[PDB]
Amino acid sequence: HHHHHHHHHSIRLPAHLRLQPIYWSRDDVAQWLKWAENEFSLRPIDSNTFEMNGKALLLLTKEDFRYRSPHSGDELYELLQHILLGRDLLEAARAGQDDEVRILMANGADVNATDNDGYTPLHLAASNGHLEIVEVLLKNGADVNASDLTGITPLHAAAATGHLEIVEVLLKHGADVNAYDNDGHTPLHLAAKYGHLEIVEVLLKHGADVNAQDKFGKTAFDISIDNGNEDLAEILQK
Ligand SMILES: [Cl-]
Ligand SMILES: [Cl-]
Ligand SMILES: [Cl-]
Ligand SMILES: [Cl-]
Ligand SMILES: [Cl-]
Ligand SMILES: [K+]
Ligand SMILES: [K+]
Ligand SMILES: [K+]
Ligand SMILES: [K+]
Ligand SMILES: [K+]
Ligand SMILES: [N+]
Numbered sequence: 726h727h728h729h730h731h732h733h734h735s736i737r738l739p740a741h742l743r744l745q746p747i748y749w750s751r752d753d754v755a756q757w758l759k760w761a762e763n764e765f766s767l768r769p770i771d772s773n774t775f776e777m778n779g780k781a782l783l784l785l786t787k788e789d790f791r792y793r794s795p796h797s798g799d800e801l802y803e804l805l806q807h808i809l810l811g812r813d814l815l816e817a818a819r820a821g822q823d824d825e826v827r828i829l830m831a832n833g834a835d836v837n838a839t840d841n842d843g844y845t846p847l848h849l850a851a852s853n854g855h856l857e858i859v860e861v862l863l864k865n866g867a868d869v870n871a872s873d874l875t876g877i878t879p880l881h882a883a884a885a886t887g888h889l890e891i892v893e894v895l896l897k898h899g900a901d902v903n904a905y906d907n908d909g910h911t912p913l914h915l916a917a918k919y920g921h922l923e924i925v926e927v928l929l930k931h932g933a934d935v936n937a938q939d940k941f942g943k944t945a946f947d948i949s950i951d952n953g954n955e956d957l958a959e960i961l962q963k
Contacts, residue, residue, distance in 0.1 A: 726903020726911065726934065729872035732837040732845065736807055743841040745812060746805060749779025761797075761804055768796040783809075811838030818846035818862065821855040826862070836865045843873030851891050852882040859891050869900045876906035884924050885915035892924050902933045909939035917945040922957050935961060 731737065741756045742749065749757065755772040762770050774793045775782065782805065790798030814834040817825040826846070830836065839845055847867040850858040859879075863869065872878045880900040883891040892912075896902065903911055913933040916924040925945070929935060938944055949957040 726901050726905065726937075728876055728907075729870045729878055729901065729904055731839055731843055732868040732871040735835070735837045735839040735845075735871070736804070736811065737839055738808070738841065740841075746779040746783060746808060749782070751776075751778050754779060754782060758801070761801060765797075765800060765804070767800065770794060770797060770801075806833075807835060807838075810834035812840075814838050814846050815840055815844065815849060818855065818858050819849040819853055821850075821853060821858065823855070823857050823861070826858050830861070830865050836862055836867045837871060839871075843875075845871050845879075847871070847879045848873060848877070848882055851879040851888065851895065852886050854886065854888045854891065856888070856890050856894070859894055863894070863898050869895055869898045870904065872904070872906070875908075876904075878904045878906075878912075880904060880912045881906060881910070881915055884912040884921065884928065885919050887919060887921045887924065889921070889924050889927065892927055896927070896931050902928055902931045903937065905937070908941075909937075911937045911945075913937065913945045914939055914943075914948055917948045917954075917957055917961070918952070920952065920954055920957060922954075922960055925957060925960060 739760050741753050754775055754777060758770045758772055787799055787802045790802040794801060810829060811834060814829045815838055817829060837845055847859060847862045850862060870878050880895045883895060905911055913925060913928045916928060936944060946958060946961045949961060
C-alpha cells in the first residue's frame, strides 16, 4: 500500500482543454496544437493551419488533417478521436450503459481514459455501483489502481459507496488494499466513515492495515467512534 498515481501513458489534457472539443474556442484549438506538438514530439505546427473552433475541427476528416499537416495530421486526427471516445467511455461507465461500454471498447476507446479530475472509467463504474462494467473494464485491461488527483483509487471509491461485490472483484484483480489518498485515508477508513461493516470485514481479511492513521491523526476505529457506530467499532477491536 502506497500513494498511487495516474495510469502512465493516459492522455491528460491541459487546463484550457478540459471542456469537450465541441466547446473549444478558436484559442483552445491553437492551444491544443501547441500542447500536442510538445506531448507527442511532433514537427512544428503552424497554428494558422487550423483557423477554426472545435466544432469545426470535428467536421474535418483525416484527409483534411493530412492536407493541413502532412507530417502530423493523422496523429492529430487520432488524438481527437481518442479524446472523443475516452469521454464517451467515461460517460457510459458512469451511467451504467453496459452495451455502450462494450461497443466503445470494440471501437478502440482507451480503457484508461482519464478526465480532468483524474477519474477513469473503472473509478466511475465503481463509485456508481455498476458491477458488470467494472468486470468488462477489467477484462479489457483497466488499471485497477489508477488514482484520481486526490489519490482516490477504484477500491477507495467502492468501499466508500458501499458496493461490496465491486470491492471483492477489485481485490481479486490486484487492487491495493492499503492505498492511501492525499489525506492519508485508506479504503478501510472510508468504509468505516460511511458505515459499511461488511466491507470493513472483507478489507481486513485481505490485509488492510487496521492501524493506518490519516492526516488528522485518526484510525478507522476513531472514525467509527466519531460516527457513534459501535457495531463497527467492535468489529475493528475484535
Ligand atoms: Cl503546420
Ligand atoms: Cl489512412
Ligand atoms: Cl476525406
Ligand atoms: Cl479523454
Ligand atoms: Cl464502542
Ligand atoms: K506518463
Ligand atoms: K487541468
Ligand atoms: K472527428
Ligand atoms: K480512425
Ligand atoms: K471476478
Ligand atoms: N472475498
